[PDB]
């Protein structure tokens, strides 16, 4: 029927709604190829191949973009789509292939399924750099 999952690495956010359909995988309004940078488009294409174009042909994903840089947004989108496909396989479509899909996703890397805690720290004291200090005179 439908599932709603989330993905957040860095400041960027992503909410992914996965529903049955004819393959309308749309990132809000714009498509996934028209972003402009193909370097991130390759990473967006990466999770698609490990799962299956024929499988994705039967489901529509509503993907929302809100905030963060290019890399942060692409990472959040990847987390959102990975959790969406895992939850949809757990819920509706098929359970037998879910274990294989999650095993191969875990084997390839750890950042595809769950993101990283790596973030920006509060500014300390001493210098403009987060770990710098003023050039003390003598």
């Amino acid at each position: 029927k439908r599932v709603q999952t989330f993905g957040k690495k860095k400041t960027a956010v992503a909410v992914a709604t996965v529903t049955n359909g004819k393959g309308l995988i749309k990132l809000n309004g714009k498509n996934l190829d028209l972003v402009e940078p193909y370097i991130l488009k390759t990473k967006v294409y990466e999770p698609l191949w490990l799962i299956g174009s024929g499988k994705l042909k039967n489901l529509d994903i509503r993907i929302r973009v809100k905030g963060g840089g290019q890399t942060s947004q692409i990472y959040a989108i990847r987390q959102a789509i990975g959790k969406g496909i895992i939850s949809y396989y757990q819920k509706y479509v098929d359970e037998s292939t879910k274990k294989e899909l999650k095993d191969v996703l875990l084997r390839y890397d750890r950042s595809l399924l769950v993101g990283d805690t790596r973030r920006c720290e509060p500014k300390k004291f001493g210098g403009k750099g987060a770990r710098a200090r003023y050039q003390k005179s003598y």
Partner: protein, 180 residues
């Protein structure tokens, strides 16, 4: 099952020194479509080598003047460089980079007496010398940075004098041999 820039699966790898291969950790585990992978690199000791060599090149070639942070520009330059290499050299650009890395890295040095060099250090200084040769090639020489990178990497793959890495590992070897 992975092609580099959707082009090179690099299924064939030379025997090399059977240690630089482990250090660069090139495999389907580290197979990547495009550079700038943000996996953990400073977790433990071995994660310095767990990073792909293609990622290390784009992480380390971007250090001169105002170029700090221009990692997308680094990706563009290296992606164009692979196309240049595939044209003006018939061999695979990945094989060109691999041969240049295995044969261009210094083997021993001096800090005091002469000592050896770690294998992760060997691949590190190989990357460093390739990048810094690219820097001096692009430093106000009319000719462009992409052509500079391609020429330096193919010259270091063919073991010629025009490669800064090749002409500098020789200096390191001779100075360390003279010391000990």
């Amino acid at each position: 099952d992975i092609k580099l820039f959707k082009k090179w699966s690099y299924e064939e790898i030379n025997i090399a020194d059977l240690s630089l291969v482990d250090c660069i950790a090139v495999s389907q585990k580290a197979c990547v479509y495009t550079p700038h992978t943000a996996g953990r690199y400073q977790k433990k000791r071995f994660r310095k080598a767990l990073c792909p060599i293609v990622e290390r090149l784009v992480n380390s070639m971007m250090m001169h003047g105002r170029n700090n942070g221009k990692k997308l520009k680094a990706i563009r330059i290296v992606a164009y460089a692979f196309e240049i290499i595939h044209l003006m050299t018939g061999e695979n650009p990945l094989q060109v980079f691999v041969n240049a890395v295995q044969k261009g890295g210094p083997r021993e040095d001096s800090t005091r007496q002469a000592v050896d060099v770690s294998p992760l250090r060997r691949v590190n200084q190989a990357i460093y010398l390739i990048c810094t040769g690219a820097r001096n090639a692009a430093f106000r020489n009319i000719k462009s940075i992409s052509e500079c990178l391609a020429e330096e990497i193919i010259n270091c793959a063919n073991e010629s004098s025009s490669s800064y890495a090749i002409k500098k590992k020789d200096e390191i070897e001779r100075v360390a041999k003279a010391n000990r």
